[PDB]
């Protein structure tokens, strides 16, 4: 009780005497080679890259709206950057699916790990398939928003239940 968490005394002795496949507190001491071993910034970035970051550690909220056309935007501010997207709209080949997903991001946990929306949106598109569409803001703004739509090439499987299913699957399964 008196000393991280490492087991000592009797229970670690009876973990070493048999070969128990789940030790109660395993660890892995990590040494460094080059310039990363002396400066604190490089070592910290390496630790961030190593430690596992699921998507829900860098999210604020997820809100499923209903915009049948992207030019409606019941959301009271987001017509500006999807109007920047509306200067040249892309991927309206089959239809337009109305059911939308919308993630806000928290910049303390985001800038803590040196991440951005471009490699998150690179990961959640290249890696899942092409079943979604991931649009996002510019880094000038304070809030970080990325809108997600389902692919129209199936509508040419109710998409409310389906879109909540990928909403509660992308929050837990992304491994950034």
């Amino acid at each position: 009780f008196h000393y991280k968490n490492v087991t000592l005394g009797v229970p670690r002795l009876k973990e070493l005497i048999n070969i128990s496949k789940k030790p109660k507190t395993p660890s892995l001491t990590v040494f460094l080679l080059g310039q990363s071993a002396r400066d604190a910034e490089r070592a910290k970035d390496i630790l961030c890259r190593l430690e596992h970051t699921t998507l829900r550690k860098v999210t604020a909220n997820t809100a499923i709206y209903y915009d049948p056309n992207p030019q409606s935007t019941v959301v009271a501010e987001d017509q500006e950057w999807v109007n920047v997207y509306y200067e040249m709209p892309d991927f309206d080949v089959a239809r337009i699916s109305p059911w939308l997903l919308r993630v806000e991001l928290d910049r303390k946990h985001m800038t803590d790990r040196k991440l951005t929306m471009e490699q998150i949106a690179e990961k959640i598109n290249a890696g899942f398939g092409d079943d979604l569409n991931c649009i996002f803001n510019d880094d000038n703004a304070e809030k970080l928003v990325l809108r997600i739509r389902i692919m129209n090439s199936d509508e040419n499987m109710d998409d409310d239940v389906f879109l909540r299913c990928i909403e509660s699957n992308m929050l837990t399964d992304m491994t950034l």
Binding site: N61, A63, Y66, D160
Partner: protein, 114 residues
């Protein structure tokens, strides 16, 4: 964000989509009562969970004989110079050492953090 009950059989109204006027329709699955949606949003999920408990604490806590009191911070809405303070006493206890106050004057019930 709320919930909708049917006006005939008093059950839960589900959202549905019609391919005619592009408007959200709330339907029932026992009868088929219908109506349109005014806010046109269905699901919302708050993960920050930064709800300020100023909306959850009750005004009658100032009747507790086991809570500390103060003469320093007076009430603003009535000017009473006696308050009773405490902590969050709930979840979200990562950095939770704030100090919510409640005025102790009868029939004031004013609450405020600092």
């Amino acid at each position: 964000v709320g919930i909708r009950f049917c006006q005939e059989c008093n059950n839960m109204l589900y959202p549905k989509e019609d391919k005619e006027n592009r408007i959200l329709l709330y339907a029932c699955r026992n009868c088929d009562y219908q109506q349109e949606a005014d806010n046109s949003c269905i699901y919302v999920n708050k993960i920050t969970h930064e709800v300020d408990e100023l909306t959850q604490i009750i005004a009658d806590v100032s009747q507790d004989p086991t809570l500390p009191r103060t003469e320093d911070h007076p009430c603003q809405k009535c000017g009473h110079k006696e308050a009773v303070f405490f902590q969050s006493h709930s979840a979200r206890a990562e950095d939770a050492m704030r100090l919510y106050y409640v005025c102790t004057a009868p029939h004031c019930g004013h609450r405020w953090t600092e």
